[PDB]
Unconditional design. Sequence first.
Lengths: 102, 73, 304
Amino acid sequence: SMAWHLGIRSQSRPNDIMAEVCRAIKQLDYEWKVVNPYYLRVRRKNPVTSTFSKMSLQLYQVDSRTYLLDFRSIDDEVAPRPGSHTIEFFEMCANLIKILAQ
Amino acid sequence: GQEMYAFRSEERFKSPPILPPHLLQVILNKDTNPNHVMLNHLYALSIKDSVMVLSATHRYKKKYVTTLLYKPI
Amino acid sequence: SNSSVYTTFMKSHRCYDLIPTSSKLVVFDTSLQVKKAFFALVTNGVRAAPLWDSKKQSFVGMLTITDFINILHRYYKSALVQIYELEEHKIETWREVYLQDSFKPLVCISPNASLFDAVSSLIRNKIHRLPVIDPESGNTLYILTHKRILKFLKLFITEFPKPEFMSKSLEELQIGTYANIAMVRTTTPVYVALGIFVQHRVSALPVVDEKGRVVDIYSKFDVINLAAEKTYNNLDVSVTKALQHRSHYFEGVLKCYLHETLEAIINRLVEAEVHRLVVVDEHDVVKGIVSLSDILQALVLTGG
Ligand SMILES: Nc1ncnc2c1ncn2[C@@H]1O[C@H](COP(=O)(O)O)[C@@H](O)[C@H]1O
Ligand SMILES: Nc1ncnc2c1ncn2[C@@H]1O[C@H](COP(=O)(O)O)[C@@H](O)[C@H]1O
Ligand SMILES: Nc1ncnc2c1ncn2[C@@H]1O[C@H](COP(=O)(O)O)[C@@H](O)[C@H]1O
């Protein structure tokens, strides 16, 4: 676990990146709002737990050929119950990536 | 009743913003033997042998945990 | 002696208080291949990982070095009978293969619960890893250990309102194990040691010479080194050969006498950052073990 990369990079057209992520969000039944053309706030109801989780997506330019999609979790507001805000953020990200990218 | 004209800045959002609100593209962590607010952001290793490794640092009160999830794709 | 300066301290402090400012936590999805999970422990320099069941959307257990040892031992024996499953097993399938009807749910603790409750939970459940889980978030924050707890106690408790029992010996307090000590020899194969770990459920094995004098120590921790190799086929090597891989340097084995005070032993253990001392006589012959499990059990019932 040497080299950690912030989000994921693409040389696809930014218009195509946003279009596809919005398509995936809709496909996964997440709700979303467009803050900027390159900035989305998304919300998902957990099917098992019934809780809500929120995250932000932000597209950045890193080269003249290269873009980076950044994901950020949004904070809310004896044996464990179902749920982990942190692990669910990971799953949300992985689900969005799988269903919109490569 | 004259026709009205629209002035469109068009390109405030020509291209995605350039990166750094000091967000580092790469964090290099070596087990040899802070960074202000990359808090809550997703990091990942290169996919190896069909396993994703997702990571983020979150705050609980005054304590910080960097959680890594190993997950098959 | 005493109610306890210790018992009082433990009841007045929250688990949150022992969490370091920064830490890492490795979590495995239960569909991960077991072989990948164990390499990830080595890679991250971590001895335990919570297990996330994605279908259930919850933590369901832990994967520790003990589990690696159970799996490696099973793998070694099964290979002799040409059964090669386990290593392509996912975490799920190994857990189902052992925890059949035998219920072992995840034991955890709130950051707001007392240190006394944490210690009691470790002892009662016969466990070495206690995840601190925030009930509001569901987030695991930290994995509590005996080592961390004793260090915290030593550091934050004043010396000189001092319990009478601190100046009493292991002998008189009857702290430690003094019979049926699981040990190995210099030339004992790794696979034999693994079977010993599996049967006796003990965290380390003293390595002794022909005269029963301690010369080395093979901890469970020394075993995950094996997960770094791609082959696994080198389980026929001696424990001595296996410990060449023990990165650092080695003074002797850390020992004690039966007649040392609880204070001296706590001090030695905390400085060394080690889970047990080998109790030895005048001539290095092993007489028993004094583990952090022993010490914390005593401190929670007041020294004795
Ligand atoms: N907090 C815990 N809750 C439930 N099971 C555990 C916990 N910690 C360890 N175990 C399991 O208990 C056994 C002994 O683990 P250890 O305490 O690491 O030697 C292993 O099979 C672990 O997977
Ligand atoms: N190699 C060993 N042989 C016999 N008893 C042991 C050994 N290691 C630890 N013990 C005892 O087993 C209990 C759990 O210790 P540990 O496995 O170190 O947490 C304690 O009472 C120890 O004194
Ligand atoms: N009494 C001891 N003397 C010398 N080394 C030890 C002793 N106990 C554990 N170790 C070593 O310290 C490391 C941590 O083991 P543990 O204390 O089981 O976490 C391992 O490499 C052990 O071999």
